[PDB]
Amino acid sequence: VQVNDSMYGFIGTDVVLHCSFANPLPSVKITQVTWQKSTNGSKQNVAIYNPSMGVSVLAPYRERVEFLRPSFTDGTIRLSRLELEDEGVYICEFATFPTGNRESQLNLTVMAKPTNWIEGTQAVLRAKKGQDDKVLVATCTSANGKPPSVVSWETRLKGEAEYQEIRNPNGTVTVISRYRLVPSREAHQQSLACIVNYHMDRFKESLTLNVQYEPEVTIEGFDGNWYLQRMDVKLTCKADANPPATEYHWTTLNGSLPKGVEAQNRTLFFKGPINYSLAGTYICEATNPIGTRSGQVEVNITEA
Amino acid sequence: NDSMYGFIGTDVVLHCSFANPLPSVKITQVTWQKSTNGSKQNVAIYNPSMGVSVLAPYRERVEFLRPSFTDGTIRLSRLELEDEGVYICEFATFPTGNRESQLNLTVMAKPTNWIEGTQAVLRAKKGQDDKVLVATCTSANGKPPSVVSWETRLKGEAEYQEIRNPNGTVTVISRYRLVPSREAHQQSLACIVNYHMDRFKESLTLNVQYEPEVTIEGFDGNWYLQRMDVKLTCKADANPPATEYHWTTLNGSLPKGVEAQNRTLFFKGPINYSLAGTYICEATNPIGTRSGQVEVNITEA
């Protein structure tokens, strides 16, 4: 807010801090050029150039700071292998005689690319008719970023995202987003993508939900013409269920399974000539670990 | 963390020295700058190899006491308000870099004090519930502000006003108001201003005009049958003084023969069992008229 000059560089990288003495006169003799850092209400010395005694660099900076082209007018330095603790205000001061000192300051901000990942829930997801609880389904994390990234979601699911930002000791910020929804049949196998944006980079990872649900039964095998005397036709029970259906049981809307119709393993075979007596509604009851549910087909018997 | 205070016009010494001069460490230059605030301007420089340099506008006001590898102490002369600020003294050294010390300079000003009463003619009057201005105490161009207060047995309201002037000083003005009364007359009113343990004091004496308050004296417990030659005297407390005195009784008439010469009421010679009664003097003044009474007893005793 007091400084008009700001530098930014990523952890690990080098930045060039500039300082020049604008308007040299024959009168002004430049006595010494001093870089200092302040975190604020410390000033501490960084590097010095004296035209007559040479260059000094103080620790911690002994291997990381060096003047580019030391001169009566130039005290530009390079700071290498940038570290988070390098953040601060850097002051460059030209000591001159008899004209006094001149200084210029700048801000150094150190940036860090975050580490991003999506991880799904470790629970099993059940669609139950009872619970209307919003359950955790995926977590997207952007850790150790600086400045903080922006997290968001891309999905067709109707759910709720919570956000949490944590300032770490080192000044980086971890962003966490939790996606919660109420598990339903329509949610199964739906894609859920986590998007993370940092200084215009774009991370994206996807999950596919796995939601358990009780069976949704349909019966296939009845075409238009189950005409009289026709033989060897059958119905198959299609149980849409997660996990898959374990047991099957056939029955009719007019009592138990008749003679001339026997059930094995989810297909109902009608052995022998067809007759009017077999017309009716046939039912299949499929069972999985979640529950039992049923489906039917109206079977009318033709004459062709 | 280090603060200096000096008065306008005086000289102050701003100390700077280098604690632990060390074999390695070569002092390159010594520099004073004044920061007013967020700005650093150069004040004086001492370079061992090149000498001393004082910069405008200080050439005639600043000098190093004893320039040296380790002492940069200066004297700032003829202090002015505009000298307030933070002074930084920096030792440039090699190869250890710069070492600096700061101090705050606060410039002080002793205020100028005085009191003045109203030009108005303070006049007591029944029914006037209104407080009127009677003295103004001023402590002008002080810094920091002084503290103004009154010392009187009057029971009035003092208001205070504090004005921050462009130059940074502060004028303090106190106005003392009261409802004018007979008792307030001739009472002293003293403003007192305390500045840095100095105590200034200046007094006024109120002049309040009032309608007369009448008293009648000359009366004696025992008054004979036939005592001689006996007087009553009407002392009227008034300001300005009463100019007219008129006598009467509570039953209208002045019993012959009682002669009135003003503000004395002589009875010749014989007294009797008449000469009963209430006696009244009516005093008048530019305010005023008002009266007093006496119950007069006479027996053989």
Side-chain angles (χ1 to χ4, degrees), chain A residues 1 3-28 30-38 40-127 129-157 159-185 187-237 239-258 260-268 270 272-304, chain B residues 1-25 27-125 127-154 156-210 212 214-224 226 228 230 232-234 236-249 251-255 257-265 267 269-294 296-299 301:
Chain A
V1 194
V3 195
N4 294 355
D5 192 359
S6 276
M7 307 292 302
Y8 306 75
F10 285 91
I11 298 191
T13 73
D14 305 341
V15 302
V16 184
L17 302 197
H18 282 106
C19 189
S20 324
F21 180 117
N23 284 131
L25 279 182
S27 337
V28 308
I30 283 74
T31 295
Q32 183 165 125
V33 179
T34 309
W35 276 104
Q36 293 165 294
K37 175 190 178 184
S38 106
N40 277 54
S42 31
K43 273 162 94 160
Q44 98 186 63
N45 299 281
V46 170
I48 305 99
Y49 169 68
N50 184 313
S52 78
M53 305 186 206
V55 169
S56 156
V57 182
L58 318 203
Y61 300 101
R62 286 226 320 277
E63 277 89 16
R64 286 162 57 232
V65 175
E66 94 178 37
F67 291 86
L68 291 198
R69 79 192 75 102
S71 156
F72 277 104
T73 52
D74 182 298
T76 294
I77 58 172
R78 169 178 287 113
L79 214 210
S80 292
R81 263 81 64 23
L82 226 36
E83 289 159 23
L84 258 9
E85 321 83 75
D86 290 326
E87 271 207 44
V89 175
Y90 288 81
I91 302 157
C92 178
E93 168 169 30
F94 277 84
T96 86
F97 185 100
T99 222
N101 300 357
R102 197 208 291 283
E103 77 194 40
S104 72
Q105 330 187 338
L106 52 80
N107 276 252
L108 215 212
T109 291
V110 181
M111 306 183 288
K113 288 161 196 166
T115 294
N116 312 321
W117 72 96
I118 190 170
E119 65 190 336
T121 171
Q122 208 62 195
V124 295
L125 299 160
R126 276 186 208 7
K129 25 249 64 264
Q131 323 110 3
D132 215 58
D133 294 316
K134 283 137 191 186
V135 137
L136 173 71
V137 138
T139 292
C140 178
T141 298
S142 195
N144 316 318
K146 178 167 187 320
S149 23
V150 175
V151 181
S152 58
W153 297 90
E154 205 172 76
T155 178
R156 291 165 100 253
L157 293 163
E160 293 178 6
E162 160 189 293
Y163 303 84
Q164 186 189 2
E165 300 201 342
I166 296 187
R167 192 178 294 92
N168 303 311
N170 61 20
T172 64
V173 172
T174 291
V175 183
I176 313 196
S177 184
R178 282 170 260 255
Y179 202 87
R180 306 185 180 97
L181 100 195
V182 177
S184 73
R185 167 61 177 101
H188 187 246
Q189 271 162 179
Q190 282 296 127
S191 176
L192 171 54
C194 146
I195 308 303
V196 169
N197 260 92
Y198 174 86
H199 185 219
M200 280 35 180
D201 295 327
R202 195 212 183 202
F203 166 99
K204 172 158 165 186
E205 254 207 286
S206 282
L207 280 183
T208 291
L209 301 190
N210 171 47
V211 177
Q212 296 178 354
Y213 53 83
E214 56 191 15
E216 284 142 35
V217 171
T218 55
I219 324 293
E220 298 166 3
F222 178 62
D223 71 346
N225 77 340
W226 277 21
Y227 53 56
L228 254 27
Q229 203 61 32
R230 206 249 247 227
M231 315 242 358
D232 288 337
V233 56
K234 64 167 189 277
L235 262 17
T236 52
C237 186
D240 175 17
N242 188 23
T246 281
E247 309 139 32
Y248 293 94
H249 179 237
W250 289 88
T251 182
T252 82
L253 229 51
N254 292 75
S256 277
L257 231 40
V261 202
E262 293 313 343
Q264 191 202 344
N265 292 334
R266 112 181 208 246
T267 130
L268 182 71
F270 289 80
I274 270 184
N275 59 239
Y276 287 119
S277 131
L278 304 175
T281 295
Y282 291 90
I283 295 174
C284 179
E285 316 182 344
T287 306
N288 84 332
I290 301 294
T292 293
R293 273 291 186 304
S294 75
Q296 55 190 247
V297 292
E298 202 157 336
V299 168
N300 70 338
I301 295 310
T302 77
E303 181 196 314
Chain B
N1 272 25
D2 192 316
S3 298
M4 311 284 308
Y5 304 75
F7 289 101
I8 281 164
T10 69
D11 309 344
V12 303
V13 179
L14 304 180
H15 297 94
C16 193
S17 75
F18 187 145
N20 280 319
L22 281 237
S24 196
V25 170
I27 281 58
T28 282
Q29 185 165 308
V30 169
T31 300
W32 281 95
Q33 319 173 261
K34 176 197 177 182
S35 158
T36 220
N37 274 248
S39 84
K40 273 172 151 201
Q41 66 157 154
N42 301 276
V43 173
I45 300 78
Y46 165 67
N47 189 313
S49 333
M50 297 170 68
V52 165
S53 156
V54 185
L55 301 177
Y58 293 111
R59 305 97 320 172
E60 291 140 11
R61 315 176 47 199
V62 174
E63 50 171 342
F64 294 85
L65 290 209
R66 88 205 26 130
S68 141
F69 284 104
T70 59
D71 191 309
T73 300
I74 62 191
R75 164 181 304 113
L76 217 203
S77 301
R78 260 78 63 21
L79 232 27
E80 45 185 277
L81 275 337
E82 301 74 16
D83 284 319
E84 285 228 3
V86 168
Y87 292 78
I88 305 96
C89 176
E90 155 191 317
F91 279 80
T93 84
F94 194 107
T96 51
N98 301 13
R99 219 261 260 325
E100 71 190 45
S101 70
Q102 308 181 352
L103 43 89
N104 279 246
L105 209 207
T106 291
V107 177
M108 298 166 302
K110 205 184 175 191
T112 275
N113 312 315
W114 78 93
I115 189 169
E116 53 183 321
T118 27
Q119 264 77 10
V121 281
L122 296 182
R123 192 163 311 171
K125 179 195 281 183
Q128 176 188 169
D129 304 340
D130 278 54
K131 275 143 293 181
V132 146
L133 173 68
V134 311
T136 299
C137 185
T138 306
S139 181
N141 312 305
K143 176 179 200 292
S146 58
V147 169
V148 180
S149 80
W150 300 84
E151 198 180 83
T152 181
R153 43 183 70 116
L154 292 165
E157 304 178 355
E159 149 191 309
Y160 302 80
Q161 191 193 352
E162 295 201 345
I163 298 156
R164 190 179 304 104
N165 305 301
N167 69 13
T169 61
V170 169
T171 294
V172 175
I173 304 174
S174 182
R175 272 167 261 255
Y176 200 92
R177 302 187 176 106
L178 73 141
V179 49
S181 54
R182 142 62 198 152
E183 37 276 20
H185 183 252
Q186 280 182 340
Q187 275 304 170
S188 67
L189 176 61
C191 100
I192 300 291
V193 5
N194 292 129
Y195 173 87
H196 175 228
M197 263 52 210
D198 284 314
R199 185 167 176 286
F200 165 93
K201 163 171 173 175
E202 197 184 349
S203 321
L204 271 190
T205 288
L206 298 195
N207 194 356
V208 181
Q209 298 166 17
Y210 50 98
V214 192
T215 314
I216 299 164
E217 306 163 17
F219 182 85
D220 178 31
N222 83 75
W223 260 10
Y224 306 166
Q226 120 137 197
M228 337 42 138
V230 89
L232 279 189
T233 182
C234 162
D237 175 4
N239 172 2
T243 36
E244 293 185 337
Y245 303 68
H246 195 256
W247 296 84
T248 311
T249 192
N251 277 16
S253 56
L254 267 185
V258 311
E259 180 201 306
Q261 150 117 293
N262 40 341
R263 129 188 218 334
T264 24
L265 200 265
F267 304 125
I271 313 302
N272 33 223
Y273 263 71
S274 172
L275 302 203
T278 299
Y279 288 104
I280 76 175
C281 171
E282 286 194 332
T284 261
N285 94 53
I287 268 26
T289 298
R290 270 283 195 181
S291 62
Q293 290 194 350
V294 167
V296 69
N297 282 351
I298 31 205
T299 327

